[PDB]
Protein: CRISPR-associated endonuclease Cas9/Csn1
Amino acid sequence: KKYSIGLDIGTNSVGWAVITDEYKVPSKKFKVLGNTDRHSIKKNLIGALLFDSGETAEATRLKRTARRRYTRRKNRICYLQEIFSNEMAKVDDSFFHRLEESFLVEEDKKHERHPIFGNIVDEVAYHEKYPTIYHLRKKLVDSTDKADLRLIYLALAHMIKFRGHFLIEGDLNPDNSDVDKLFIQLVQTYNQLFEENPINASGVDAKAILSARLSKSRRLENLIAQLPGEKKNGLFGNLIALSLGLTPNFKSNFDLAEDAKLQLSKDTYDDDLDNLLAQIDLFLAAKNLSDAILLSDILRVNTEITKAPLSASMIKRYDEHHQDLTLLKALVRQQLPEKYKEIFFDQSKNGYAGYIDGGASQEEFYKFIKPILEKMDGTEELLVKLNREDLLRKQRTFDNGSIPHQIHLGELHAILRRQEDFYPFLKDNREKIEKILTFRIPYYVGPLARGNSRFAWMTRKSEETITPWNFEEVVDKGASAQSFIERMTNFDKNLPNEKVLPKHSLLYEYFTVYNELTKVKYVTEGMRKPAFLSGEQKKAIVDLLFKTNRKVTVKQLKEDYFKKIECFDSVEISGVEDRFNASLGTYHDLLKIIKDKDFLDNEENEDILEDIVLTLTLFEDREMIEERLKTYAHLFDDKVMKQLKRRRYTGWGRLSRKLINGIRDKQSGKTILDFLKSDGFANRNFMQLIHDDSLTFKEDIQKAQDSLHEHIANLAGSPAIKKGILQTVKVVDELVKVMGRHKPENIVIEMARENQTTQKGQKNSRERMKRIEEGIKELGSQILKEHPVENTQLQNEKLYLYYLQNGRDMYVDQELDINRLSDYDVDHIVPQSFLKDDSIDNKVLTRSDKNRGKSDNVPSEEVVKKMKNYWRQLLNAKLITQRKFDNLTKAERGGLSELDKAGFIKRQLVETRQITKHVAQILDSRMNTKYDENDKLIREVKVITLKSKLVSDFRKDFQFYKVREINNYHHAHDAYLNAVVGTALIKKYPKLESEFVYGDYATAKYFFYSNIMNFFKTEITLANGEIRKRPLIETNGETGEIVWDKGRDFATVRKVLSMPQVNIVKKTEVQTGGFSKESILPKRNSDKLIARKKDWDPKKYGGFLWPTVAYSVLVVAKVEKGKSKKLKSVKELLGITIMERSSFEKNPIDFLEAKGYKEVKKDLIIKLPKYSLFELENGRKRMLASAKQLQKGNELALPSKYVNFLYLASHYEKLKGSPEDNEQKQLFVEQHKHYLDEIIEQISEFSKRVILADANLDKVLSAYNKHRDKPIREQAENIIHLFTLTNLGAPAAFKYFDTTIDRKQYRSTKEVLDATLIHQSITGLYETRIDLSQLG
RNA sequence: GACGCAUAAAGAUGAGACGCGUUUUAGAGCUAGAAAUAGCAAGUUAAAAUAAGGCUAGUCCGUUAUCAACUUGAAAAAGUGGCACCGAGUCGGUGCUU
DNA sequence: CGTTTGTACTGCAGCG
DNA sequence: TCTCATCTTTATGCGTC
DNA sequence: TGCAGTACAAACG
Ligand SMILES: [Mg+2]
Ligand SMILES: [Mg+2]
Ligand SMILES: [Mg+2]
Ligand SMILES: [Mg+2]
Structure:
């Protein structure tokens, strides 16, 4: 009467099995509804539920932000048009209309078809006179004539529409740069400031450096070889400070004005300049020189005097494009005329025609044309350009990602300065246009909604419509930025109405040091036993060395405290190993700035210091930090305030101020921190205080502490875990409804947790800085001597990757620079568009252009040749992983492939952990509802939580082998075995219920769970060869009850695993998502195209082509078809696509009449979602997949001897057993060689029954007969692929040894219009069978 | 089985920007030609759209999640389905019973 | 006698 | 691809219910 | 892994 439930929970499936107390799986007869005559079904209470994996919300977030950027960009253009409109009315009234409607064909355009000037001669002359928009922009920048207002608008609109990135702060000005001679201006400035006859007769300037990659070695050798300066400050120490940073934290060289720290032009370099402005302009040339150098790095324009450097570079690309194109055409004509059409006309290939008019990328074009240019004669210049990636460049390419907004801003400023004289309105609102360009909504303000968007936390000072000119006056940035952090920080889990403290807060750090320190035990020779510290001793320790050293080690504690204070010869310290996990880092940081230590020691200012830390943790805007901390002006020096506004803190703790220092025990009056600081002789820590009954903290916590779906909606985190948790709770609820509403005693849950030895644990969690140091010391670079770093800083992903690449780029043989890590990027080897993989094995830090050129592809094979040696050097220095090396050299082993795609992604295991961990507690709280006053919760239902290692070892040890590819019964079987072994362990070890039952309470731990399964074993083999004989019948021990009988229980289990009928049910999901695959196909004369706007006929404009069908609907109606049209009765599936689901559901009958159906019977409309199950002759089951394709739905019940033989025949040499066990398994394989032909007969019979792919069956049998003399291991590991032929799910394609049989998609939803429809309940037990033959 | 701290692996949710790509149109093709065509020369850029759209009209919102049937309820959500045994090719058979 | 339903076989999917 | 911010799962170590 | 396309051949009117 009593029973249990086992669950094997995964990401895309949940398994379930019900067992009685003798491990037998019960079975029952069930009623089946519907109009069919069949009235009862026998089903075994074991099965699996399968569903598509829950998708995460990143795929939605990316599209949503993209839609926001497009919405804001169109509004930028509308703002510019609104500024220009009153003047455009004078010169060309319909010009904005012609631009706006320019996508329409000529017959639909209301105005003249030529957009800009509106007549043929003006338009063609304009395109002759300015071939590209950059010609126009350079002309406007460097011309003083009144230009056409339409041309002005086009230049400004182009600049605003494509405005470059904002990653560079400040006023990086091309206008005060772009001429590299300013080294001479710097040296006469050095002549003015430095008086001991400084060098003015200089040699080679920084041009020789800007020719190649910027480097300290190159720079220093150039400066020494061309400038033997009297001071290394003058020749090196100043010029780097105008052009680079200084590596050490030590002071700079011998000072001229002040010897403090010097650095590159950082965000605080202006306050750094007090080393000269408070002492004495050389450092005024710093901005100019650095901007000129870095802009010369960005752009290949130095000699020209033009004020538009980006446009100069683009026009240079254009003219070199033209010259090299003419030369290439003439050359290919004069040597290879036969290749002329292939290169310059055939746009299907990667020739020049495909590179311009077709879709071939620049890298594909280069790899196509390089063999021709190498074969041909006279193309050395072109080949050199190709190796420099300059041959036939486009103006707008992927490389333009590195152009900053300041260059566009400088060009626009020059344009408006030029044209302010002729048009007054460009001088009146020049600031308005400039703000239209340069404005950007801050990341902490979010979408500017007005209470109708669930993502918006913005709050506003007035109800005005927000424009970029009044954003600062309208949006309350203070409250908005505060809410930007407060809306995501976790509440205190004990006190749910409190926000947690910053992790670097002073109260938190005092809590942590005292909590970790009040439990340390010391012992001396004199006294008897270890005891805790006294309160005064704790006070002395913190005030002596925890307030005066950033970290405290055991040796520091023992010599520095005990050997000098309360002097003892030697003391042993227990409770800490070598160094303390706690620290006072915030206090030390504020001691290095706030020189007044007694101010930090004071108590009345604790609220002030907490407010300071709260501000530094919340706000990171510089002005905002000043606005908030400005109330502390009278407390501190101005320079102190200057240093305080530089210290950024981040990260929030797990506790609240009220919990750690606010609530007081009414008997005593102390808080938690006070009890930690002094509690006499007991010295309880935080938990031991909050759980001590004698204190009011426990009751104050307890007193301070709808549907299941609504609780799930309350649960934060991933939206993917919700599907798994909700499905498994629904399955368990269905089982408890089936079994007479009696709750099971035991529920077994397969946790994916694991135990490891402590050596493997500390190896796999070793310090990241030590990981870097080992490889750096191995390959012998001086990078860590040059650039010190601490393991806390290495949490920066890019700094991590910089050190793992030994400072050098990986795809290109160029050194990186720490100071400009923003200019680089973190590249996935295997791209995001292919496979979700963010492991550090899959991240490489390269230059921006190389990553963006290497789009959605593994590294190119030329790159592989260039850097296979360096990657081998890193692997020998074990900075990279062997998996990282295999990814990096992927191009040699075939490149991208389905072998790479197929597998278990690292995300699914985290998904399994999260789902299963939530399911444990949700099942405990759902089942166990009988609270009590004697004890809080009566454990009516035990939720046993087994680790997967136990059940897997059970399978490996009793030959109940698991093979994934054969069928989907294995989920139900794993659930069944989990239930068996969990109940068996609880019955056999009632003294060991407490570590398995959820809700009761390291090398030893791993050994402890190795021996727990010994009682199942008949014999125990040790390393010494001894054996131990166990009794055939096991007993409970202290109670004497029989639990596990190795005679009959194994027979029962082996009987269950050979069961043929198991309830396999696939979830009937109504599809939702994007309306169609996003590729915009060109125009054709067909109606399968989807119009991408309501006004654009796809036969003229092209559109999307692959629609998703949300759910199919069965219709019975009349259609008007024939040579002479007549009404014909017809019954077929109609696809409802997602773009059109809402329009259907609003009015079904009218919609179907609009489709052309007549006499639709409204009652017979059956919504058939995806995966609906039909049943046909001989039990053939077909799963509906859309409205046209059907999926396979039967499952192969392969016998256990065959399954076990297949697994044992595979893995033939890696059996991991003793030689004798391997030999006996091998001999067993030898003496069942006939099982191969047996299994082939099984596949043949099953496929002829239900798969009905006779051609592929014949091909597979032919392959088997022509491969039947192959080795047995190869034969088994290739016959395991044939089960893809009968596997449940979508039709698929599979290869036997060489013969590749392909996909046989069943594309004919006519046979399922007469079948029997199976509406299956959530578990697969309760069915409803509608006979579709009798409808019509 | 929980929690604090430290180290670490792999992940998650939200925001602010860039670079492209695609589609249609603008960029007069010329020459011999009845021409079916072929020769020649051009080629790089721009506009607009970038889920159809929605209404509270916001410089907002629109791909995550929820979803057997049936009796119901606007829906949230709740209710509905005999048992023993003998057997096993996707479940059957026997016997009881409402 | 003329469609047009039927397999078969291939080919495709925006991105850094 | 870049920038900024938060939370989760787990293994080990120390201390606890 | 559904949908798209290109081809061809039955199979009814
Ligand atoms: Mg599994
Ligand atoms: Mg979904
Ligand atoms: Mg990439
Ligand atoms: Mg733990």
